[PDB]
Amino acid sequence: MRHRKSGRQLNRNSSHRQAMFRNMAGSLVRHEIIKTTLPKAKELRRVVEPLITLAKTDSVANRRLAFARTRDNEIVAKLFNELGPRFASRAGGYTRILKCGFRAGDNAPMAYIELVDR
Amino acid sequence: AVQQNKPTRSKRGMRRSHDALTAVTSLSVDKTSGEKHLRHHITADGYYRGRKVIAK
RNA sequence: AGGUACUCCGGGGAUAACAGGCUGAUACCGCCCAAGAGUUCAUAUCGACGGCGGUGUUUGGCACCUCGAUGUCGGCUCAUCACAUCCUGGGGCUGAAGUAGGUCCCAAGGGUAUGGCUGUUCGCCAUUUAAAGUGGUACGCGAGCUGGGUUUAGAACGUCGUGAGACAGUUCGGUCCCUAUCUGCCGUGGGCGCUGGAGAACUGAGGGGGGCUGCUCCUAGUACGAGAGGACCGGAGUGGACGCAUCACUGGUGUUCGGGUUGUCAUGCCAAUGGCACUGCCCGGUAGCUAAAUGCGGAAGAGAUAAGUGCUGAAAGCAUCUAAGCACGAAACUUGCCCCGAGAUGAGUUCUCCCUGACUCCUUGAGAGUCCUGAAGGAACGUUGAAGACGACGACGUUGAUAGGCCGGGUGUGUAAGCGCAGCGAUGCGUUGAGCUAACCGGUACUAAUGAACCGUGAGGCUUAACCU
RNA sequence: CGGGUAAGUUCCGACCUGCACGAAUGGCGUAAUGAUGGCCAGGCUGUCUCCACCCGAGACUCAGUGAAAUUGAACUCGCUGU
RNA sequence: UCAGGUAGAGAAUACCAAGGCGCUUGAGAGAACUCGGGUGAAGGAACUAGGCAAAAUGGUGCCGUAACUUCGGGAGAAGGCACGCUGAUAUGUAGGUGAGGUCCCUCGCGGAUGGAGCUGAAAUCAGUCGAAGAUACCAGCUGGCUGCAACUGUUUAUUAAAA
RNA sequence: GUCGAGUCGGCCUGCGCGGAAGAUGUAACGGGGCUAAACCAUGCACCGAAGCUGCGGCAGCGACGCGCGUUGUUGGGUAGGGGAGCGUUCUGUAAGCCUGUGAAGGUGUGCUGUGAGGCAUGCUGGAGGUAUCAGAAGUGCGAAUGCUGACAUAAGUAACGAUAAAGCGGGUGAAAAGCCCGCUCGCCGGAAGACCAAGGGUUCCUGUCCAACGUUAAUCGGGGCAGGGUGAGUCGACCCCUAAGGCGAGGCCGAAAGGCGUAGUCGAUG
RNA sequence: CCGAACCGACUAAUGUUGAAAAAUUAGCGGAUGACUUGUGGCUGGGGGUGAAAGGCCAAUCAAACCGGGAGAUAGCUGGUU
RNA sequence: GCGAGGGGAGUGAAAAAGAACCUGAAACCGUGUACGUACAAGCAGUGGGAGCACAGCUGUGUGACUGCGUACCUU
RNA sequence: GGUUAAGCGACUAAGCGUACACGGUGGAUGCCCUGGCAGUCAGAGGCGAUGAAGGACGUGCUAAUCUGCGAUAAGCGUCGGU
Ligand SMILES: [K+]
Ligand SMILES: [K+]
Ligand SMILES: [K+]
Ligand SMILES: [K+]
Ligand SMILES: [K+]
Ligand SMILES: [K+]
Ligand SMILES: [K+]
Ligand SMILES: [K+]
Ligand SMILES: [K+]
Ligand SMILES: [K+]
Ligand SMILES: [K+]
Ligand SMILES: [K+]
Ligand SMILES: [K+]
Ligand SMILES: [K+]
Ligand SMILES: [K+]
Ligand SMILES: [K+]
Ligand SMILES: [K+]
Ligand SMILES: [K+]
Ligand SMILES: [K+]
Ligand SMILES: [K+]
Ligand SMILES: [K+]
Ligand SMILES: [K+]
Ligand SMILES: [K+]
Ligand SMILES: [K+]
Ligand SMILES: [K+]
Ligand SMILES: [K+]
Ligand SMILES: [K+]
Ligand SMILES: [K+]
Ligand SMILES: [K+]
Ligand SMILES: [K+]
Ligand SMILES: [K+]
Ligand SMILES: [K+]
Ligand SMILES: [K+]
Ligand SMILES: [K+]
Ligand SMILES: [K+]
Ligand SMILES: [K+]
Ligand SMILES: [K+]
Ligand SMILES: [K+]
Ligand SMILES: [K+]
Ligand SMILES: [K+]
Ligand SMILES: [K+]
Ligand SMILES: [K+]
Ligand SMILES: [K+]
Ligand SMILES: [K+]
Ligand SMILES: [K+]
Ligand SMILES: [K+]
Ligand SMILES: [K+]
Ligand SMILES: [K+]
Ligand SMILES: [K+]
Ligand SMILES: [K+]
Ligand SMILES: [K+]
Ligand SMILES: [K+]
Ligand SMILES: [K+]
Ligand SMILES: [K+]
Ligand SMILES: [K+]
Ligand SMILES: [K+]
Ligand SMILES: [Mg+2]
Ligand SMILES: [Mg+2]
Ligand SMILES: [Mg+2]
Ligand SMILES: [Mg+2]
Ligand SMILES: [Mg+2]
Ligand SMILES: [Mg+2]
Ligand SMILES: [Mg+2]
Ligand SMILES: [Mg+2]
Ligand SMILES: [Mg+2]
Ligand SMILES: [Mg+2]
Ligand SMILES: [Mg+2]
Ligand SMILES: [Mg+2]
Ligand SMILES: [Mg+2]
Ligand SMILES: [Mg+2]
Ligand SMILES: [Mg+2]
Ligand SMILES: [Mg+2]
Ligand SMILES: [Mg+2]
Ligand SMILES: [Mg+2]
Ligand SMILES: [Mg+2]
Ligand SMILES: [Mg+2]
Ligand SMILES: [Mg+2]
Ligand SMILES: [Mg+2]
Ligand SMILES: [Mg+2]
Ligand SMILES: [Mg+2]
Ligand SMILES: [Mg+2]
Ligand SMILES: [Mg+2]
Ligand SMILES: [Mg+2]
Ligand SMILES: [Mg+2]
Ligand SMILES: [Mg+2]
Ligand SMILES: [Mg+2]
Ligand SMILES: [Mg+2]
Ligand SMILES: [Mg+2]
Ligand SMILES: [Mg+2]
Ligand SMILES: [Mg+2]
Ligand SMILES: [Mg+2]
Ligand SMILES: [Mg+2]
Ligand SMILES: [Mg+2]
Ligand SMILES: [Mg+2]
Ligand SMILES: [Mg+2]
Ligand SMILES: [Mg+2]
Ligand SMILES: [Mg+2]
Ligand SMILES: [Mg+2]
Ligand SMILES: [Mg+2]
Ligand SMILES: [Mg+2]
Ligand SMILES: [Mg+2]
Ligand SMILES: [Mg+2]
Ligand SMILES: [Mg+2]
Ligand SMILES: [Mg+2]
Ligand SMILES: [Mg+2]
Ligand SMILES: [Mg+2]
Ligand SMILES: [Mg+2]
Ligand SMILES: [Mg+2]
Ligand SMILES: [Mg+2]
Ligand SMILES: [Mg+2]
Ligand SMILES: [Mg+2]
Ligand SMILES: [Mg+2]
Ligand SMILES: [Mg+2]
Ligand SMILES: [Mg+2]
Ligand SMILES: [Mg+2]
Ligand SMILES: [Mg+2]
Ligand SMILES: [Mg+2]
Ligand SMILES: [Mg+2]
Ligand SMILES: [Mg+2]
Ligand SMILES: [Mg+2]
Ligand SMILES: [Mg+2]
Ligand SMILES: [Mg+2]
Ligand SMILES: [Mg+2]
Ligand SMILES: [Mg+2]
Ligand SMILES: [Mg+2]
Ligand SMILES: [Mg+2]
Ligand SMILES: [Mg+2]
Ligand SMILES: [Mg+2]
Ligand SMILES: [Mg+2]
Ligand SMILES: [Mg+2]
Ligand SMILES: [Mg+2]
Ligand SMILES: [Mg+2]
Ligand SMILES: [Mg+2]
Ligand SMILES: [Mg+2]
Ligand SMILES: [Mg+2]
Ligand SMILES: [Mg+2]
Ligand SMILES: [Mg+2]
Ligand SMILES: [Mg+2]
Ligand SMILES: [Mg+2]
Ligand SMILES: [Mg+2]
Ligand SMILES: [Mg+2]
Ligand SMILES: [Mg+2]
Ligand SMILES: [Mg+2]
Ligand SMILES: [Mg+2]
Ligand SMILES: [Mg+2]
Ligand SMILES: [Mg+2]
Ligand SMILES: [Mg+2]
Ligand SMILES: [Mg+2]
Ligand SMILES: [Mg+2]
Ligand SMILES: [Mg+2]
Ligand SMILES: [Mg+2]
Ligand SMILES: [Mg+2]
Ligand SMILES: [Mg+2]
Ligand SMILES: [Mg+2]
Ligand SMILES: [Mg+2]
Ligand SMILES: [Mg+2]
Ligand SMILES: [Mg+2]
Ligand SMILES: [Mg+2]
Ligand SMILES: [Mg+2]
Ligand SMILES: [Mg+2]
Ligand SMILES: [Mg+2]
Ligand SMILES: [Mg+2]
Ligand SMILES: [Mg+2]
Ligand SMILES: [Mg+2]
Ligand SMILES: [Mg+2]
Ligand SMILES: [Mg+2]
Ligand SMILES: [Mg+2]
Ligand SMILES: [Mg+2]
Ligand SMILES: [Mg+2]
Ligand SMILES: [Mg+2]
Ligand SMILES: [Mg+2]
Ligand SMILES: [Mg+2]
Ligand SMILES: [Mg+2]
Ligand SMILES: [Mg+2]
Ligand SMILES: [Mg+2]
Ligand SMILES: [Mg+2]
Ligand SMILES: [Mg+2]
Ligand SMILES: [Mg+2]
Ligand SMILES: [Mg+2]
Ligand SMILES: [Mg+2]
Ligand SMILES: [Mg+2]
Description:
The structure is cut from a larger assembly and holds chains A and B.
Chain A: H1 14-31, E1 33-37, H2 38-54, H3 60-70, H4 73-86, E2 95-102, E3 109-115
Antiparallel strand pairs in A: 1-3, 2-3
Chain B: H1 9-15, E1 28-29, E2 36-37, E3 47-48, E4 51-52
Antiparallel strand pairs in B: 1-2, 3-4
Bound molecules: potassium ion (56 copies) and magnesium ion (125 copies).
Chain A binds seven RNA strands through α1, β1, α2, α3 and β2.
PDB class: ribosome
Keywords: 70S, high-resolution
Entry title: Translating 70S ribosome in the unrotated state (P and E, tRNAs)
């Protein structure tokens, strides 16, 4: 049973999952749109959108939290200097997912995920 | 564990009576580009619900 | 003349060891006669000398099946049936005062120890229990587990043998394969049917589950008894074991939350952080799942009975529970309780909803075709769920709280960072119960749930009644 | 028979009724040693009472590739009998 | 054959360098059951042929250690205490290394003196943080009675390592 | 004593009653059911077999007459004995006969005999076939856990070879999870790094290709194809020298083959 | 003596159409010696070698492998159109 | 896909003689049509037999329902 | 005529079977012979230190293999045939 549980295992262990979404969150902030599998995209929302919410309040402590969660200073700078202000009046929902068919190699269901003002 | 008797071609067909594929019920038509596409998916040219969502 | 357990080939179920079969001497369980025991008294309880059966449970007989293989003792797991009943229920007799027993009859609903020793089954022992039943099921169960014992190859002792070797003597060591086609069984879907289609609510043929019991108290120190002791019947409470549900509490888990900390590498360095070391090692802990947690259950009642007890009553002027007639009588039976259930093809009922076009051809009929039409509803797709292997089932799709995010709260952790102060410094203190906080709660259209398209039709056979026209 | 245990067919100490020990196919002892045999205790624990939750890899679904033993023929149910 | 850094006794072990790799099916899901692991209330061998497996012990220094003995042993018997960091002693100590200078010489790759610089344990006293200082990885379970074989060795490659 | 017509218990005999408990499910008439649809006795009907009869046909044996007729009778069969045949390949008959106006073989259909079989013919095929009467046999297959090849089944099931691990952007391309480039992440580091001997032998580099090979895809490869690439007085071998050991002029020994060995000559791992 | 490399193989689980015709994982023994290892040499089948298990002698051992006597023989089993 | 493979064209007496090449059997696997089949229990046939389809009452195909019926070899 | 009732009732094929038609796979069958098998009649009964049998490596306008040949290398001289 998994009654009321949240989060996808994605056939990984916990440290792999955490590292993967740290990399993928960085790619989405950097490129503003990426293509990935539909389940990974849905999981990425719960990682990236709290980072943008954090970036709405610029302070030393918040930059350090964001650095702790991304480990990339170029990503932290873009979060606080660009994305935070771009989304300052939006109450959540900073990303959108667009389904785009099936991967050739393994028939995986694919999707684009982008920032909503891209 | 293994069969004691060779199953027949009739029984083989009966087992496969659930194997047939189902075609997509119907495709959707983009209101701007007129392309057909899987419902709730973008078109081959990058439209969704009438908006050019992605380049190429 | 011997050995082979270091072994080998050709054969046999022509022939043994296991299990089945036939048999039933033996075994076990009934019964008949009644010498006697029992103060008297054969029959409360035992029953000598002898007699007659039943079972298929023991030890055996046979050699019918299997030697081109039907794996063994015991344990473990899971059972299922019989009744010759261990407990609980009902009853007759007693050498039955009571309490407690003896013996026989009825009864198979449910229940029916944990340990020490040993490979043990068994048995003895310790301590429980209402009780620790007896048997059948390949001495149930190794394509379910074990492998201690038996029964390969190593080695030794006693013993036998000149010896190789041998011993249901002993001793230490010694490979347990199989992805399930069919039947069966547990679950879960797809198809078509049920006669126009569709959405619901049902009826209940039938099936399954459940059914155990202790102790204390009252009745009552009453009945009984010289005392010692000590009830039936009836009523109340509280447990054991078992079962179902649940998570409010008490807790476990909680690699998705917070913190402490060792070694090391990195982010230029300080400070702050991240990676790796079993989640590095640990301390706490949210939701969920859960037992050790805490709610509930077994019934009462009814019907028809078993053994048994009767009423009235002749046959047979009496007697007689029986022949006619009438009444009681148990955890067994049929119900009552819970769940499934109309594929119940004998395919049931009720409520509601939907469809009221045109034409042609033919072999002329429950016929075929074209045009127009496309309902109720369904499905699909999407967002999903304390629903789930997949199907299925439930919620929702902008006329929207379905999911994520966001906002507020709660909870958890336990006073972040930065700055300042004190201290030579480790560190302490202030800002500060701070910061962070998953699955929780209340809100909120920010994101994603698209207009469509698809399936499903167009008033529904014949015969005969009844009623109206 | 004694010891140990609530309880000990094993174990230890004895007895001698040695079925069938016995003196280099050695007898009786023996410190140390042993992945050697038996028995007891402290610690320790999911071995167990009696299992619960969690993390991973399979099992399950989708796409690609693609085996095996076996097989007289099958329209391959239960029971009681034969 | 070669053998870097930090910790370490170390060629153990952990994390890294140079350098080299992610192992030639993937994507989802988050049932039973199997495999490999983590934690567990109360109990603690009741399990079982048998504590099989698991859990546990585990470092250094010091204190301390029985029967028995072939006088070597037994013995790491057993059992116990201390352990991080900071400051002081001492702006870095004991010790190691050793320059200039100075002196001598049978004048050198020399002796003697001298000690700047560099390196650097261990201890004691005081303070200080945490539930925990051998904090991770790593790393003995211990004791009692007894059979057999003295001992280290050897053996049934592939079910027997033993007497 | 009352009461007023039967009563009592032996024998033999028909049918029934108790005695009577078993394991998956009624389960001891085959079932339904039966009070006769049970049992006894008597009788008359009917059903019932591949038995008997009727009708038609074939064969064996024996009679009787002229191979034929007539007649009687027989015809279940394993081991096994006896009798009579079908078809296949090859030799003669055959320098014949059939056949491009379509042979053999293949595949259908019709007819035919008691059978093995025979005949005809449509389609396919595209060059052989062969009467009759004789002759000879590698002369007939379902089995031998037979032999060889082909193809099934289980089944689109198990599995895809260490649980060190991936994510994304760009490129190329018909197509990219896997190739190339980039950033990030993770793993080894007394090795999963570097370099030799042995062993292998072109696997090396470049271009090109993706059938097969690669447990998937592949634009990639230790795969296909083509071209290129290995430079020594000093490194190694060869070489000088010997060890164990081998061979060994003569020699000694042995039926033969050969055995041993002296002088010698080989032999690195030195 | 403790313990890596190296040489072994006591226990358990897995695996048993394996990743493997003897392994993997966690533990385990020896580890200056009767040690271990490279290269080359020698011993040959009733023979070798054996700290001895009938062990080993090329995944083969109570008499190796290959070829031959050879179509051994088979009072047995199967099959026989 | 400057593929594989195929469709045309052409050669040839013939290309279902196209190099995976004469003939091209059987097992095995498909597409099309006719009839049967979702209340029915077993060597799957045989005897009886309705209905439907087809070709000319009959021939062919199918076979609801029903009596009977446990393969072959060996030993 | 309609309504109701009772009774009876075809058209479904997820798939499966039999028959037929047309295919796939596969390589039987027939037909075929520069290969074998058994002989008869003849020949020759050896080759080698003048270096054999059997090989290695070369050899072409040649990348490979077969056949031939040998640094004079699919060949050179001479005599005959054609
Ligand atoms: K003998
Ligand atoms: K023996
Ligand atoms: K009997
Ligand atoms: K009997
Ligand atoms: K009896
Ligand atoms: K047997
Ligand atoms: K039982
Ligand atoms: K009772
Ligand atoms: K009684
Ligand atoms: K009972
Ligand atoms: K025991
Ligand atoms: K016993
Ligand atoms: K048995
Ligand atoms: K077993
Ligand atoms: K057993
Ligand atoms: K079995
Ligand atoms: K079956
Ligand atoms: K019941
Ligand atoms: K709770
Ligand atoms: K909880
Ligand atoms: K760190
Ligand atoms: K009476
Ligand atoms: K219904
Ligand atoms: K929401
Ligand atoms: K503070
Ligand atoms: K602070
Ligand atoms: K707080
Ligand atoms: K001796
Ligand atoms: K001695
Ligand atoms: K040992
Ligand atoms: K010992
Ligand atoms: K490491
Ligand atoms: K799943
Ligand atoms: K110093
Ligand atoms: K230690
Ligand atoms: K001794
Ligand atoms: K050993
Ligand atoms: K006749
Ligand atoms: K024909
Ligand atoms: K023909
Ligand atoms: K065969
Ligand atoms: K298949
Ligand atoms: K492979
Ligand atoms: K692929
Ligand atoms: K040596
Ligand atoms: K030997
Ligand atoms: K060999
Ligand atoms: K031999
Ligand atoms: K042709
Ligand atoms: K063909
Ligand atoms: K029939
Ligand atoms: K046979
Ligand atoms: K036989
Ligand atoms: K059909
Ligand atoms: K075929
Ligand atoms: K050549
Ligand atoms: Mg949720
Ligand atoms: Mg996976
Ligand atoms: Mg980790
Ligand atoms: Mg069988
Ligand atoms: Mg299927
Ligand atoms: Mg032995
Ligand atoms: Mg044998
Ligand atoms: Mg027997
Ligand atoms: Mg018997
Ligand atoms: Mg027999
Ligand atoms: Mg007999
Ligand atoms: Mg039998
Ligand atoms: Mg058999
Ligand atoms: Mg069997
Ligand atoms: Mg009874
Ligand atoms: Mg009952
Ligand atoms: Mg009841
Ligand atoms: Mg004990
Ligand atoms: Mg024991
Ligand atoms: Mg048994
Ligand atoms: Mg039993
Ligand atoms: Mg079994
Ligand atoms: Mg099993
Ligand atoms: Mg055993
Ligand atoms: Mg052993
Ligand atoms: Mg097993
Ligand atoms: Mg259904
Ligand atoms: Mg029941
Ligand atoms: Mg709660
Ligand atoms: Mg708690
Ligand atoms: Mg925890
Ligand atoms: Mg720092
Ligand atoms: Mg790292
Ligand atoms: Mg690392
Ligand atoms: Mg009652
Ligand atoms: Mg009376
Ligand atoms: Mg009760
Ligand atoms: Mg379901
Ligand atoms: Mg709080
Ligand atoms: Mg912190
Ligand atoms: Mg909050
Ligand atoms: Mg005793
Ligand atoms: Mg005792
Ligand atoms: Mg003793
Ligand atoms: Mg002796
Ligand atoms: Mg003796
Ligand atoms: Mg003597
Ligand atoms: Mg002697
Ligand atoms: Mg002696
Ligand atoms: Mg001795
Ligand atoms: Mg030893
Ligand atoms: Mg698949
Ligand atoms: Mg190092
Ligand atoms: Mg290491
Ligand atoms: Mg799942
Ligand atoms: Mg799991
Ligand atoms: Mg587990
Ligand atoms: Mg644990
Ligand atoms: Mg616990
Ligand atoms: Mg705790
Ligand atoms: Mg505890
Ligand atoms: Mg304890
Ligand atoms: Mg015990
Ligand atoms: Mg026990
Ligand atoms: Mg252990
Ligand atoms: Mg452990
Ligand atoms: Mg130590
Ligand atoms: Mg120095
Ligand atoms: Mg003893
Ligand atoms: Mg020893
Ligand atoms: Mg062995
Ligand atoms: Mg062993
Ligand atoms: Mg009787
Ligand atoms: Mg019964
Ligand atoms: Mg007849
Ligand atoms: Mg007859
Ligand atoms: Mg006649
Ligand atoms: Mg006859
Ligand atoms: Mg006959
Ligand atoms: Mg001829
Ligand atoms: Mg011919
Ligand atoms: Mg002829
Ligand atoms: Mg023949
Ligand atoms: Mg054949
Ligand atoms: Mg035959
Ligand atoms: Mg076979
Ligand atoms: Mg096969
Ligand atoms: Mg597939
Ligand atoms: Mg299967
Ligand atoms: Mg499966
Ligand atoms: Mg799988
Ligand atoms: Mg792999
Ligand atoms: Mg990419
Ligand atoms: Mg990859
Ligand atoms: Mg090559
Ligand atoms: Mg290369
Ligand atoms: Mg290349
Ligand atoms: Mg491929
Ligand atoms: Mg391709
Ligand atoms: Mg290439
Ligand atoms: Mg290549
Ligand atoms: Mg010599
Ligand atoms: Mg000589
Ligand atoms: Mg020499
Ligand atoms: Mg030399
Ligand atoms: Mg050398
Ligand atoms: Mg060894
Ligand atoms: Mg190991
Ligand atoms: Mg040692
Ligand atoms: Mg050691
Ligand atoms: Mg020989
Ligand atoms: Mg032996
Ligand atoms: Mg061998
Ligand atoms: Mg011999
Ligand atoms: Mg001979
Ligand atoms: Mg032979
Ligand atoms: Mg082409
Ligand atoms: Mg031709
Ligand atoms: Mg052809
Ligand atoms: Mg064919
Ligand atoms: Mg029915
Ligand atoms: Mg039907
Ligand atoms: Mg059936
Ligand atoms: Mg029948
Ligand atoms: Mg069909």
